[PDB]
Amino acid sequence: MQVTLKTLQQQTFKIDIDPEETVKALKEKIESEKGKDAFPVAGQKLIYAGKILNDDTALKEYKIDEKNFVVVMVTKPKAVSTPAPATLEHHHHHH
Amino acid sequence: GSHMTISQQEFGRTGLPDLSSMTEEEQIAYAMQMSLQGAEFGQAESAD
After folding, report:
1. I need a labelling partner for B20 at 20 to 30 A (CA). Which of A8, A18, B28, B41 fits?
2. CB pairs under 8 A between A and B
3. Cα separation of A8 and B30, whole Å?
4. Which of A59, A48, A67 minimizes the C-alpha distance to A26?
5. CA nearest to A77, candidates A24, A8, A25
6. Which of A8, A50, A78 sits opposite B36 (nearest CB)?
7. Which residues of B touch chain A, with CB atoms under 8 Å apart?
8. In this complex, do B47 and A78 lie within 8 Å of one another by their Cβ atoms?
9. Interchain pair A71, B35: CB under 8 A
10. With contact defined as beta carbons under 8 Å apart, do A45 and A77 qualify?
11. CATH code of domain A1-95
């Protein structure tokens, strides 16, 4: 089940998670996909329809949709892997 | 001061910070409002 994710920085992604599993498994997939540096299980929180998801409760209990979005946040730090000018590897053109 | 001493509630913070001014509770309430509005609640304050 391909839940759409949204961040506090207003970035958006998707997570193909098993709806047979609990909210802890959604957290596991987020840590798996984004890495422990961005979103560790122990530091991320999960929010749907204005309510925090209980990690031990199942995904079906909140009727999460694929086209709608869940919100994920991470406490204390706010740093992320920003990009840089990839053109530096050539810095010239055919023109 | 001998003036009327009242103020104008007509104004406020339009564009929220990138979390820099918000407590953990305020960062949470911002997270709530986003998913709540996605759930079609129409930007109301009613969290349930």
Report:
1. B41
2. 52
3. 8
4. A59
5. A8
6. A50
7. 18-19, 24, 27-28, 30-36, 38-39, 41, 47-48
8. no
9. yes
10. no
11. 3.10.20.90
Q: What one-character-per-residue DSSP string does chain A give?
A: -EEEEE-TT--EEEEE--TTSBHHHHHHHHHHHH-TTT--TTTEEEEETTEEPPTTSBGGGGT--SSSEEEEEESS---------GGGGT-----
B19: three-class secondary structure by DSSP = coil
- Do B28 and A45 count as a contact with CB atoms less than 8 A apart? yes
Domain boundaries, chain A: 1-95
Q: CB neighbours of A8 closer than 8 A, spacing ≥ 6?
A: A71, A73, A74, B19, B27, B30, B31
For B8, other C-beta atoms within 10 Å of its C-beta total: 5
For the record, the structure tokens of B2 come out as: 């001998």
Position of tokens 């329809």? A49
Which architecture does CATH list for B1-48?
Answer: Helix non-globular (6.10)
Amino acid at B23: T
The residues facing A13 across adjacent strands are A5
